[PDB]
From a paper:
We thus performed additional studies on the homologous enzyme (75% amino-acid sequence identity) from the oral pathogen Treponema vincentii, TV0924. This protein also exhibited acetate kinase activity, and it was amenable to structural and biophysical studies. Our structural and biophysical characterizations of TV0924 revealed that the protein has a homodimeric arrangement and a two-domain fold, both of which are similar to other known acetate kinases (and, more broadly, to other sugar kinases). Enzyme assays demonstrated that the protein has the ability to catalyze the substrate-level phosphorylation of ADP, forming ATP using acetyl-phosphate as the phosphate donor.
However, TV0924 crystallized (albeit after a 90-day incubation period), and the crystals diffracted X-rays to a dmin spacing of 1.36 Å. The structure was determined using molecular-replacement techniques employing a model generated by AlphaFold2 from the amino-acid sequence of TV0924. A single copy of TV0924 was located in the asymmetric unit of the crystals, and the model, after refinement, exhibited excellent geometry. Overall, TV0924 adopts an α/β fold with two prominent β-sheets forming the respective centers of two lobes. In keeping with conventions established with previously characterized acetate kinases, the lobes are called Domain I (the domain with the N-terminus, residues 1–148, 388–400) and Domain II (residues 149–387). A large, solvent-accessible cleft is located between the lobes, and previous studies on acetate kinases and other sugar kinases have identified this cleft as the enzyme’s active site. Intriguingly, the difference electron-density maps in the cleft region reveal evidence for a small molecule bound there. However, the shape of this density did not match any probable substrate nor any molecule present in the crystallization medium. Compared to other acetate kinases, TV0924 has a C-terminal extension of almost 50 amino-acids (residues 401–449). The protocol identified a single stable interface (across a twofold crystallographic axis) that featured a total of 6,110 Å2 in buried surface area; the server returned a Complexation Significance Score (CSS) of 1.0 for this interface.
Numbering used by the authors:
A (entry chain A), B (entry chain A): -3 to 449
The structure:
């Protein structure tokens, strides 16, 4: 088939470049991978091509430009590559963490848009610099395609002022744009649209609450198909318990600890972002799988951390049920913990039965796959409970494709491929076949999509 | 009657001493008042004796000791005083803001207890110093009676670790006692016991949520008669919108503003505590009455502030309903806004009807008095809604009396006078008679107390 409608997506950190290559016309992920230790000694690419063994190559990358060059060379390599030449790529979608209130939707990057991103860089100091370096790097390597910014905060720009304002001097909002922004926008967008499909409803008629529980974790209250409130803040620090981030805390606590320790703002910022969360409580574990294993071994710090995560999730579900003003149609679990953390999901939902959330423990225990969307609520639960594995890369891919085509708009005026009842994820469909060979009962909880033919 | 069982209560700030004199055996408030501008030029006492016109006298008070001496001289004065001599006072109850996790209940002050308070002073740096100066001052003026500490954090010491731990390095808890403490303890204790009386239930069987909405504002989740969670934090800054405090905020926001402004921790701490909240949003108003009046005049900043307060209250009610694991027996509004802010109460409760909270707007509009406990929910509301005017001074009075007598203990093992169905507040009963002359329909919403004869 025609292989020339390929989209590259990139997510660049201070020392890494994650990539995916998507063939739009054949609806397939051709490859994904990561360059690690970018700007550091020992840079190394790990490249996973469809149907091939993992490929690993050490090659120095003192800059993000070297990392993008290494990706392209690997993708076009005759033996391990997946595209015939670099011109097979027709657009690049880049992750940008923070758009302030200057960006409500994805954009094609221009010099003026880059200047605008510089205005907001100070809102996302720990993330935007490397995202922008990645844009600048890829623009040099792939100069003849549109480079698009898909912005983690943009989904949340529908929040009303009563949700996004902090109770702070109004001049801090007016002069410094201090307000709640929220993150995980591509994940919430994707899972909100999938939830509408599963419910058989137009998005604008849906009222749902989504928990993206990954290493970073946040919740979104989706009222009439749009973000109404979300748990992260000006920055990704606020809200739920996370792997290394504190989430919610008395704003005066960091200042107290500073007076006790001598730490300065940047150090306190690092402690709250890199040494808190589950790692801080347990003293050693970031991954929820390690927390759960240690709890089962009797580790009281892990048991505490697990329970703190559960309790804060319960409180946020309660808060956002209140915020919705009505019973939600559904709650959604996504990201790694949402998809695999059956014990977290059980403990959260068992504490919410008086709010209409009734999990079925047998269904919940079966939902331990990234390859299927499932319903784990009891048949008669007032509120449906879905596990919807996310697909941030597909949002980035489709935004770049639609911007390149000229049809992209904000989601209240734009229709995504994955809003179709007949949308399929080819790689996940193949993985599900394998999952069902080993656990046939999983088939009984896969969602039944209205109108899917 | 015998007039010699008198208790003095004191609440000392950096420039003020508030006092009340309670005759225990005659169950009556003899006087209350305040010395203002203590330690400052123009110190002045305002003294309100039962049945008398307000008395105001300017008299220099360079120290809290001078302020306590002025109070005692005024109380024993032949024309404006209320007690024959200083030895009529048999105990003094002092407000202490912060007890850390070292104090779970009220105590008679000794030198060793004062040393222990010094260990925890750094947890309550903005409040404890003047509270302790007040103790030391009154011990010199009234050396022959017990001085008792009634501690705003103590009520909350029943919180379990899953509620009180922040997701921070465990060493910050272990070395610096960093955790959630909560405040308004005397108000929550009093109103929780009154709510149990009104419900006709033993306290240990009650599950209620209390909103103390004063200039400072916080909420308490009372599970099985004990604090389970509360909205203030390590310090009084966390949680609800307040007159000048921010409440909840991304912990990284103060550090961002610092980089934008040059402010240092103590200054940022002052901005978040003294220039935020309603004052920050509106730019000029602290009192909810001014916010509501300005909203009615069309002030968009006041309308925003009012709505932010309402919305955060809704979210906390939702969170604490979740935390309870069951429908609450009741929600309670108290303190000045809880007692008089009918518009806040209406807006909050109308957004919670799907959580069982059904206000009756006619009842709600009648509940604008400090002189009665009322029920403002619809007759068939799943969750009762009570307005219970608080009485922090009575808790302080009774704790001091019971400590002096030797019967005091933590509230799970001690019975207060106001747990009786037949408890009456004499001054409020007289004020209610006057309220009913002007608004007879108020009588229809006054609580009917089971077992009250």
């Amino acid at each position: 088939y025609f292989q020339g409608m390929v989209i590259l997506t990139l997510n660049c950190g201070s020392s890494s470049v994650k990539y995916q290559v998507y063939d739009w016309d054949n609806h397939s992920v051709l490859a994904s991978g990561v360059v690690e230790r970018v700007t550091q000694p020992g840079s190394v690419i790990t490249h996973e091509a469809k149907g091939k063994d993992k490929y690993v190559l050490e090659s120095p990358c003192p800059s993000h430009t070297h990392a993008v060059e290494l990706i392209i060379k690997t993708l076009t390599d005759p033996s391990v590559g997946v595209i015939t030449d670099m011109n097979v790529i027709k657009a690049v979608g880049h992750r940008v963490t923070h758009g302030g209130d200057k960006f409500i939707k994805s954009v094609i990057v221009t010099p003026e848009i880059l200047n605008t991103f510089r205005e907001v860089q100070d809102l996302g100091p720990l993330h935007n610099p490397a995202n922008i370096m990645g844009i600048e790097a890829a623009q040099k390597v792939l100069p003849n395609v549109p480079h698009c910014a898909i912005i983690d905060t943009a989904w949340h720009q529908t929040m009303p002022e009563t949700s996004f304002m902090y109770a702070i001097p109004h001049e801090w909002y007016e002069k410094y744009s201090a307000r709640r922004y929220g993150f995980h926008g591509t994940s919430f967008l994707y899972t909100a649209k999938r939830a509408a499909v599963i419910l058989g409803k137009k998005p604008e008629d849906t009222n749902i609450i989504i928990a993206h529980i990954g290493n970073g974790a946040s919740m979104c209250c989706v009222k009439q198909g749009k973000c109404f409130d979300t748990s992260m803040g000006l920055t990704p620090l606020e809200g739920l318990v996370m792997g290394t981030r504190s989430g919610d805390c008395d704003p005066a606590l960091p200042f107290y600890i500073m007076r006790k320790t001598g730490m300065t703002p940047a150090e306190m910022d690092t402690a709250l972002n890199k040494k808190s969360g589950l790692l801080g409580v347990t003293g050693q574990y970031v991954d929820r799988r390690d927390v759960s294993k240690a709890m089962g071994e009797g580790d009281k710090r892990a048991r505490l951390a697990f329970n703190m995560e559960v309790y804060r999730l319960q409180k946020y579900f309660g808060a956002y049920i209140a915020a919705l003003g009505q019973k939600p149609d559904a709650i959604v679990f996504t990201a790694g913990v949402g998809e695999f953390g059956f014990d977290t999901r059980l403990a959260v939902c068992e504490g919410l039965t008086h709010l209409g959330i009734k999990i079925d423990p047998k269904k919940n225990a079966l939902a331990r796959t990234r390859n299927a969307e499932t319903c784990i609520s009891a048949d008669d639960s007032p509120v449906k409970i879905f596990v919807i594995p996310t697909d941030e890369e597909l949002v980035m891919t489709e935004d770049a494709y639609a911007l390149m085509k000229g049809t992209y708009d904000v989601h209240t005026k734009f229709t995504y491929s994955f809003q179709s009842p007949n949308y399929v994820n080819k790689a996940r469909a193949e993985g599900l076949k394998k999952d069902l060979e080993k656990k046939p009962e999983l088939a009984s909880i896969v969602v039944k999509i209205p109108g899917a033919r």
